[PDB]
Amino acid sequence: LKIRDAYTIVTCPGRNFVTLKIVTESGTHGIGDATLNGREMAVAAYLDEHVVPALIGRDAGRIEDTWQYLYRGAYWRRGPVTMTAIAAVDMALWDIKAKAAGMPLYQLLGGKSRERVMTYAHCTGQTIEDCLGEVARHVELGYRAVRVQSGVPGSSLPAEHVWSTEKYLNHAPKLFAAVRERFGDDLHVLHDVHHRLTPIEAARLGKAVEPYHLFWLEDCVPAENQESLRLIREHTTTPLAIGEVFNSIHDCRELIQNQWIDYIRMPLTHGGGITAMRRVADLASLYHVRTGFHGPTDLSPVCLGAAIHFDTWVPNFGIQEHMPHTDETDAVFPHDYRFEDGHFLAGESPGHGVDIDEELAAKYPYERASLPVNRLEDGTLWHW
């Protein structure tokens, strides 16, 4: 049916979320995540001031046409703000389509390819032992996979961290050796290098950690230049993951087609929604590349519900990141996905199974918060 109303909701139940809600003339509604961490109000404005008014009166069933209308119609294509706005609309429209079909989203997409969706948890410590304790506690929660991180020896506005590549490189292998010593070989172990290396440095790290058989080594190098992955891929057999900072298939087409990565990390709310990410996943599948959606707290339960539905259907699923939201957040975004024994189970309610309690949301006003920056020991502004 026709779109009668559309508007954003901004709320901060432990952290900032922006949500787009679309309401048809029949009263059926859908919501989509529009949260872009540290730049939230840019997306809110992109929506409120430019997209939202153009949605009014459109046929809500025309998902593809609306995607193209917003993507091409913007004239200025791609980008974090642009593609997050588009994702929010797309996610809301799929929510409405699934409701109209009377099916949970995963059925609409082609049905379930699996009975449960494997997640990984974050295990972080100041020391290696601190980290190991976190691994133990997540293993007990039923997690089959853990991302491990420990300190390297030696906020409203961005916090400023200090970084040393060489100290990190000499130290990191010790962490994975420790994990394997304590927990053995069955456990999937992931590591996020978080953009801090050059390609030949990452190649060195990849080789160094081969004996520990990592599930992936993530975001080795900044990849605006996709060729950056080539030296890494040519020098190590440690699996590679990338893409949480991407927003377009055009950010990763070459990475995938040249087989320079094993996992694509771009999530629904930043990658143009269901419509676009279906195309990204399908391109990946031609090259044995699997999905590994970014799943931090800064993607709302709306994205997570939609992602679990997507994960349930997509043939080339790899893994789903899990960073639990706060109780307050979960309360603001009632949902029917559930977590059991290290895995998500998709909801059965028509739609993506997530809603937003607007009354509750209104109790948590926006509070500005920025991501940190990283500087080298000489002060050079680096990659965080």
Q: For a copy of itself, give the closer residue by CB, 45 or 103.
A: 45
Candidate list 3, 10, 22, 44; residue touching a copy of itself; CB under 8 A: 44
Of residues 215 through 254, those in contact with a copy of itself by CB under 8 A are: 222, 224-225, 245, 247-248, 250, 253
Q: Out of Mg ion, a copy of itself, none, which partner does residue 192 contact, by CB within 5 to 8 A per kind? A: Mg ion
Which positions ≥6 away from 258 have C-beta within 8 Å?
Answer: 226, 230, 233
Distance CA 31, CA 108 (A): 17
By the rule CB under 8 A, 68 interacts with a copy of itself: yes
Q: Residue 95 or 298: which CB sits closer to Mg ion?
A: 298
Q: Taking CB under 5 A as the rule, which mask of x and - marks residues 229-248 in contact with Mg ion?
A: ---------------x----
Among 33, 40, 134, 192, binds Mg ion (CB under 5 A): 192
Q: Is 186 labelled a binding residue? A: no
Q: For residue 332, give Cα distances in angstroms to 39, 171, 184, 239, 262.
A: 21, 41, 39, 37, 35
Q: Centre a 10 Å sphere on the Cβ of residue 245 and count the other Cβ atoms it contains.
A: 16
| Position 323 contacts a copy of itself (CB under 8 A) | no
Regarding 381 and contact with a copy of itself (CB under 8 A), the answer is yes
Beta carbons of 25 and 2 less than 8 angstroms apart: yes
| Nearest-approach distance from CB 255 to a copy of itself, in angstroms | 13
Sequence-ordered list of residues with C-beta below 8 angstroms from that of 84, at least 6 positions apart, any chain = 34, 35, 36, 43, 247, 269, 270
Catalytic annotation, residues: 194
By CB under 8 A, residue 167 contacts a copy of itself:
no
φ, ψ for residue 161, nearest 5 deg = -100, 160
DSSP 277-342: HHHHHHHHHTTT-EE-----TTS-HHHHHHHHHHHHH-TTB--EE--PPPHHHHHHS-B--EEETT
- Residues near Mg ion, by CB under 5 A: 192, 244
- Residues near a copy of itself, by CB under 8 A: 36-46, 48-50, 53-54, 65, 68-69, 72-83, 156-158, 222, 224-225, 245, 247-248, 250, 253, 270, 368, 370-371, 373, 381-384
